[PDB]
Each structure stands twice: as C-alpha cells, then as structure tokens.
Design a protein around this ligand. Structure first.
Ligand SMILES: NNC(=O)c1ccc(Cn2cc(-c3ccc(N=C4NCCN4)cc3)nn2)cc1
Ligand SMILES: [K+]
Ligand SMILES: [K+]
Ligand SMILES: [Zn+2]
Length: 357
C-alpha cells in the first residue's frame, strides 16, 4: 500500500495582520511537516502536489455570492480586509487568504483522486486554513470554504453521485458547516465528536446536540456525540468509537473516509481543554483504516499547540503507513458524563441503525 502526503508552504501566507499571535498560525503546517521529516515519515510517503480549487469546484457546496466575496478579498486594502473579517464570527482575512483556502481544497481534491483511482491507498493533507465551520453562504471560525464537504462532493463528481462518503470530525468543535451541507443527504454520513457543554462551547448552537439526527432522507446520517462536564481523553474517545462510530460506519459501508482531523482535543491545546494523547489519535486512525478497504484521507482542521499537533498528526501518518498502534498506558476509567453522552446518542440513532438495536 502507498500513503500520499500533500503539504505546500504557500498555505503559510494567510496571516492575521493586526494580531500576529492569533492561534491559527502559519507555522501550524510547517511544524507538522518538520515533525514528519524528524520521524523520517516524509520519505515513506508519495508526495501529492497541491493545486488551486476551481470556482466551479467551490460551487459544489458554496453560493456564488460567498465565493465572489472571499475572492474579492485578494484585492482589498487593509481597512476593507478588516471590515470584511468583522462581517463573520471569528475570521481574519489577508490578501493571501483566498489563494490559501483554494490550495487547501485543491490539495484535498488531488488526494481524494489519488485514493479513488488507487494511485495511493490512503493520504494525509497538511493544509490551512481549516474548513469545517464554513457554511454554503458564510465563513466562520477561521474557515472560508468547507474543504472536507467539498472533497466529498468532488469525490462523487469523479465517480458517481451516490458514492458513499463517511466524514468523521474529531476536531473538539462541532463542524456546523459540514452538518448543514449534508443534513438532507444519505450519501454522506457525518459523525462529529465535540465539546458541547449544553450549547455554551463554540460554535454555541443546539445544532450540535445528539438529537440532531438529520432531515428527510438524511434522517440517521448525521451523528453528533456531544461532551458535557469533563476533560475527555483517550478512554472517552475509544468508548465512542467502540459503541457508535465503528458500528454505524460498518453498517453505512463507506467507499471513502474523510477525517476532519482537528487536534484541538489534544493534551496541551490552549482552546480545547481536553487530553486526547498522540497514541489515542493513532488508535482512532487505525480503527478507521478498517473501513472502505483502507481508503482514508486525513485533513488537518484545528489544533493550536504546535508541539501537540505535530506529534498527533505524525502518529496518524505513522498508522496510515502500516506501523502498529502504540499501547495506551494510563487509561483512567470512563468518565460518567461521557457514558451519558454515548447512551443518549445510542438511543437517538437506534431507530436508524440495526447495528445499535
Ligand atoms: N475548529 N474550530 C476552532 O478550532 C475554533 C476555535 C476557537 C474559535 C473562537 N476563538 C477565537 C479565539 C482567539 C484566541 C486568541 C486570539 N488572539 C490573541 N492574541 C493575543 C492574545 N490572544 C484571537 C482569537 N478564541 N476562540 C473558533 C474556532
Ligand atoms: K468535531
Ligand atoms: K448526512
Ligand atoms: Zn476546532
């Protein structure tokens, strides 16, 4: 089997002009890439080139209005960049932002194409800016275009409309954009695990609760696993995979697995407040490799501790390359609040999945 890797230093050019310390730093991707070199993982991978997404590809998920507004930021003066950033929840924009967001999406399209043609078995995309909060009509939470949603649609566009795509989002935040784009769709199964805190955690919406199971023919194809009152870690994520993610995924029988792989649930993240370890991430990756005949694309989303994200994403690539999962030492017993979350999702989804009845 061959593992693809896409990384292009051009995605570093998107930057916060008036807050150089903003957590969504350029060096997130260079630090992840440098860790791959230190661990000698880069020479074991087939390098997939980045490319720009086309406007026609962006229109698979986004409105003409949204594409045109973000495109226009490439030519804006600083005052207009600052004003446009302020139209959105948690966005900064530079004149390089649009091109970086196009490269993040086209990198993922090239990776998906490599996987579906069998040029590679699996792949990792070290990309920024992130994607999962972007909606059809709006940018949000450091995201301009929904890289993972667009990749699922691009995959369907080069195979067949009904190609079965699983998106697993283990970023500590709910992928509100991904959920909304696929809410009525049974061809794309969206499974998110996220800090929820009864709706108080970003992005601050009851849309992220367990009772949002999808709409119309999409009912049962949106799986929210919300965490409340607890610093969740490896035991909680392992229990969620065992009871919910893997049984549902096997029954859906995906032909492609996209991971919205934020590492902001990692031990040491300044924003997440959780304690998933790099070995924890390796175990989750290794379980997803059992789906879709191993056709897994890992796409970087959030994660703001440069050392944590570099160790965590490298451990994931190691698993894609066939290395044995490292053992999980220091497994505390499952938090009560996590058992309740898992039970509530099981009850919400039992009507839709015979593997949960
Ligand atoms: N996947 N989604 C996310 O990861 C995700 C994570 C968070 C948010 C919302 N948001 C924004 C910031 C923020 C922090 C620090 C900051 N700047 C400085 N500089 C000096 C001191 N602090 C500027 C903004 N903190 N929470 C949205 C999406
Ligand atoms: K998530
Ligand atoms: K769906
Ligand atoms: Zn996040």
């Amino acid at each position: 089997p061959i593992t693809g890797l896409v990384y292009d230093q051009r995605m570093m050019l998107h930057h916060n002009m008036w807050d150089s310390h903003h957590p969504e730093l350029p060096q997130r991707i260079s630090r992840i890439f440098s860790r791959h070199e230190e661990l000698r993982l880069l020479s074991r991978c087939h390098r997939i080139p980045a490319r720009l997404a086309t406007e026609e590809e962006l229109a698979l998920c986004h409105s003409s209005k949204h594409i045109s507004i973000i495109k226009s930021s490439e030519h804006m003066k600083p005052r207009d960049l600052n004003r446009l950033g302020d139209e959105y929840n948690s966005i900064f924009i530079s004149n390089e932002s649009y091109t970086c967001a196009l490269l993040a999406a086209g990198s993922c399209f090239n990776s998906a194409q490599a996987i579906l043609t069998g040029q590679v078995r699996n792949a990792v995309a070290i990309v920024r800016p992130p994607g999962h909060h972007a909606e059809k009509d709006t940018a949000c939470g450091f995201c301009f275009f929904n890289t993972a949603a667009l990749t699922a649609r691009y995959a369907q566009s080069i195979t067949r409309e009904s190609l079965r795509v699983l998106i697993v989002d283990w970023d500590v935040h709910h992928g509100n954009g991904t959920q909304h784009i696929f809410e009525e769709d049974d061809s794309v199964l969206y499974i998110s695990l996220h800090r929820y805190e009864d709706g108080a955690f970003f992005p601050n919406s009851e849309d992220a609760n367990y009772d949002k199971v999808g709409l119309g023919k999409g009912r049962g194809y949106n799986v929210n696993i919300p965490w409340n009152g607890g610093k969740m870690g490896d035991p909680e994520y392992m229990a969620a995979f065992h009871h919910l993610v893997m049984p549902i995924a096997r029954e859906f029988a995906p032909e492609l697995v996209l991971v919205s792989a934020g590492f902001d649930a990692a031990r040491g993240d300044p924003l997440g407040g959780f304690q998933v370890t790099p070995e924890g991430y390796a175990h989750l990756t290794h379980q997803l490799m059992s789906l879709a005949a191993g056709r897994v694309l890992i796409i970087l989303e959030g994660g703001y501790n440069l050392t944590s994200i570099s160790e965590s994403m490298s451990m994931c690539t190691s698993m894609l390359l066939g290395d044995s999962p490292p053992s999980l030492d220091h497994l505390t017993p499952l938090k009560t609040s996590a058992t309740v979350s898992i039970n509530n999702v099981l009850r919400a989804h039992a009507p839709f999945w015979s593997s949960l009845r």
